[PDB]
Design a protein around this ligand. Sequence first.
Ligand SMILES: COc1cc2c(cc1OC)CN(CCc1ccc(NC(=O)c3cccc4c(=O)c5cccc(OC)c5[nH]c34)cc1)CC2
Ligand SMILES: COc1cc2c(cc1OC)CN(CCc1ccc(NC(=O)c3cccc4c(=O)c5cccc(OC)c5[nH]c34)cc1)CC2
Ligand SMILES: COc1cc2c(cc1OC)CN(CCc1ccc(NC(=O)c3cccc4c(=O)c5cccc(OC)c5[nH]c34)cc1)CC2
Lengths: 610, 200, 166
Amino acid sequence: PTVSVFSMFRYSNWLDKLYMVVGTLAAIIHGAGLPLMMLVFGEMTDIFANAGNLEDLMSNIFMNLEEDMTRYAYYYSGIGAGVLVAAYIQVSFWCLAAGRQIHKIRKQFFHAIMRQLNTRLTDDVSKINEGIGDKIGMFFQSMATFFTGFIVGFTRGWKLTLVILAISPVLGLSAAVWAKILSSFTDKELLAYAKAGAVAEEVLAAIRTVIAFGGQKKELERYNKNLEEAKRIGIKKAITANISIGAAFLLIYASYALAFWYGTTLVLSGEYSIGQVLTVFFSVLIGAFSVGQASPSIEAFANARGAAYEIFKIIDNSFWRIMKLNLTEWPYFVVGVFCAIINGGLQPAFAIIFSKIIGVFTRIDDPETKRQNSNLFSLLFLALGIISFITFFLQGFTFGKAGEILTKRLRYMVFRSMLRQNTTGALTTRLANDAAQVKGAIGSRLAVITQNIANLGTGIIISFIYGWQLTLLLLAIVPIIAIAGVVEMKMLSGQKELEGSGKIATEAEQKFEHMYAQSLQVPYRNSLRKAHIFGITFSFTQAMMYFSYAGCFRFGAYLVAHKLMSFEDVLLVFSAVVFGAMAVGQVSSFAPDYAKAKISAAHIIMIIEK
Amino acid sequence: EVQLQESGPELVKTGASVKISCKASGYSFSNYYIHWVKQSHGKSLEWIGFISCYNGATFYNQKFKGKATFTVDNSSSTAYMKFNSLTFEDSAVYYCARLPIQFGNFYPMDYWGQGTTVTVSSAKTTAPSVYVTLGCLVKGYFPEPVTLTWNSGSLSGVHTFPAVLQSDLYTLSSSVTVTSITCNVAHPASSTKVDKKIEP
Amino acid sequence: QVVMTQSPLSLPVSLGDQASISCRSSQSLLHSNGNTYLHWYLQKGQSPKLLIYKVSNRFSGVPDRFSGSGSGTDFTLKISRVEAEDLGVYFCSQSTHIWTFGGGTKLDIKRADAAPTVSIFPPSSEQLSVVCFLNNFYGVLNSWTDQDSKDSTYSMSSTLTEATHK
Ligand SMILES: COc1cc2c(cc1OC)CN(CCc1ccc(NC(=O)c3cccc4c(=O)c5cccc(OC)c5[nH]c34)cc1)CC2
Ligand SMILES: COc1cc2c(cc1OC)CN(CCc1ccc(NC(=O)c3cccc4c(=O)c5cccc(OC)c5[nH]c34)cc1)CC2
Ligand SMILES: COc1cc2c(cc1OC)CN(CCc1ccc(NC(=O)c3cccc4c(=O)c5cccc(OC)c5[nH]c34)cc1)CC2
């Protein structure tokens, strides 16, 4: 049922093999870039901490802080430029190799299907594409991140690295389950409606018989009995997916708690420094998470090898009216909006707790007081994890249940109005998709906006309180950091121009295959251009995350040295603003097209009021 | 174990310079300051200053600014203190102690070095003059030490008193007590072995 | 600069008995955070070893004989059973206002008094200077031996280029 790993790439020529080799080297280099970033970040933290401790000591009785921070700005910018180049080459070369091979495969498959099966020519080649393209570069980049992170961890601190080893299996498993849930989310949504979509298609295809025999009140009940099961499956999915991702968040925050309790123990015993702790922790944790994230790649490669089997065998042989739709679910919406506020407000709460536990180690104090404060802040990390688990689950569950109730109701009354009466394909799409997207204009929009406000608005407010000069500087790059998060999630998710050439294939010798070949030219060139365009977009938004470090901490060195701020405040502002922009991007990448959703709702309301 | 091994005793000419070291072992060198402390004979210890074993940032007691200089070799994990234009008032024992950077003065100096004695003298190598209770007066020599024995370690009742500076020249005396004898004085730096017999 | 004063410059003790060494600062050692940073070290040609820190906390690996007390400008170090590995110089250290140290207190073995065996010596005439020897008791210069390890008395030599005892 699957082809060979070597036989998968039999249409690659010398240029494609070169693209793969150089794209894999660039992937290794790109993946090695975040652990080196954490190494540099730890050294910078230690510079700041030592300066702060010495100033605290000599209070009653920062000279070189800016000079020392220029070098680290250079290191940050160098890693950022290297990552820019390497990410560009990786993404670009892997997309180009995949595109050239998929083009040759499409042409060969249509030549062979006629030298002698439409799904095998439309969707199976797309499965091969999804398998042999970006995902392989992702996989090598994530393997490099894992290995480099663990090398940096063991070289900087093996004791703390071992303590985080004890946890890394669960972290990689959480990341794997998370990424798999994200990958298969829409497929499961389409699969739940399968049994009711069959009834819908078979009734709408024989509508004359139905309204002639008067079986409207019975086909409605068949559809309803299947809609109940679709809704139950949707509720179960809303429970399990959200409980899994909430458990992942809880595990991340508990890892913070544990690693920082142990690391602060090692720092108070004099054996480690706080920058050393930061380096080890962030390196090992990000590596362990990257491993998990690299499992959709293996699933996709296996699916590509599965899809290539058949092919190669053949070849070889009003927003207020819309909201009023979902009005009876105001309890779910109240609970969900409350939970979305509490969920968004966890990024600034984390910024505060993190900056405080690190600022404990940037000024001198009694060892007993330092132990007490470190214990308190580790406990606060754990409490953050518990709260995030609960609120994430509740937000997801309430909004998903309201969305399921609304979808079932909309499908039901849409079918009832079609029966109390426009091709059958259009009607089945109105029932399968248009009814399932009206929730995107209500609950999804509400959740995304509430969470993003409670996150970035609160972050920016407390950042203006703690350090307004740095907040003003970082506000200029907030849009690019948010877009970086959006682009990164779109790149991980792997997210029409072939429909024109689907006609020449659906119709069907040499002339037909020549017409098909000529029809493929425009989408071929479009994909070859999109490869470069997306490579450069991704690489630039990735490098901006590295340049944010340089800018923020050079200006923070200036401010700390001139006494306008402390390193704890610089850390708080960095965390809050920068990673709240990143979280805003990551959350907004789950919001559906509000325009398409309003259009779907308009069509649904037309059909219902007809 | 935490250990701070200091260099050995030093005898220096007046007005010269000497650098003494403190080699740390058994802990993370860069998480501590090394403080330097001076003790003259019969006086309280006296803080000279400290240097950060992370970046080499120093702080000097006002009395010692310009008189001493701290440096750090992070590779070998050693700290150095160097004097300039030594004078006799710098004859003392110098200790190094470590202090955690995280706690500052909210913590004791938990581990100390064993001390380096520094004798600043301008005199030149000089051979001693050797002049019931009996005794020898080994007067006017340099530098210490000087081995005194009675009848070549034959004897109890001895009382070798410490050496005392008398105008840049040590003196020493002994005391044997026996009811009703040779006196061997060995000065290596002068390579002398004088054996006087006491006569009434 | 805080000045630290140790009351007994020399403390004759007896093996197995008790000893108490006092320290007094010219200014209160209580910090604004509620802690008092006074530490006690022992010195023997070896390195000084930390015994007590922050008035009363015993350092890691220090026997239970050593204890510390005191409040502000008045502190004490008590040794409950003076063993034989305790004879040395104890000194206090403050780190509240900053580093200054106390003058040190030497522990000495106590024994019954004795009288000096004074002995005079005229110049050996091989030159002149006159030498007095004051043995086994409990332009001039003096030199004292340390306490004898066996009989545990002192000796004194005086040289010029009376004996006022108790
Ligand atoms: C493709 O899969 C999915 C698609 C959709 C949903 C769930 C899916 O999978 C479970 C939820 N729909 C309803 C709207 C809706 C409500 C709430 C949210 N708020 C969240 O925080 C969230 C919720 C689900 C997953 C994640 C993440 O993975 C995630 C990953 C990294 C970082 C994050 O934040 C910092 C993340 N935040 C979330 C988002 C969206 C929209 C479409
Ligand atoms: C407070 O500190 C921290 C907090 C956090 C982290 C680290 C911290 O400290 C270091 C890590 N974050 C990490 C967030 C986080 C999680 C999971 C992912 N995977 C993917 O998107 C993903 C991977 C592979 C395949 C696919 C798909 O086929 C796919 C298909 C459709 C839709 C998708 O999605 C929109 C898809 N997605 C993926 C990324 C990012 C969480 C919060
Ligand atoms: C050069 O920097 C970066 C570059 C890139 C990313 C992250 C970077 O920085 C960490 C995202 N990558 C993909 C994997 C990936 C995904 C998500 C994360 N989430 C977090 O780490 C994180 C989440 C929430 C809150 C915080 C903080 O409050 C925070 C505060 C201080 C320092 C931090 O971390 C050094 C912090 N982290 C976070 C990390 C890694 C690709 C590009």
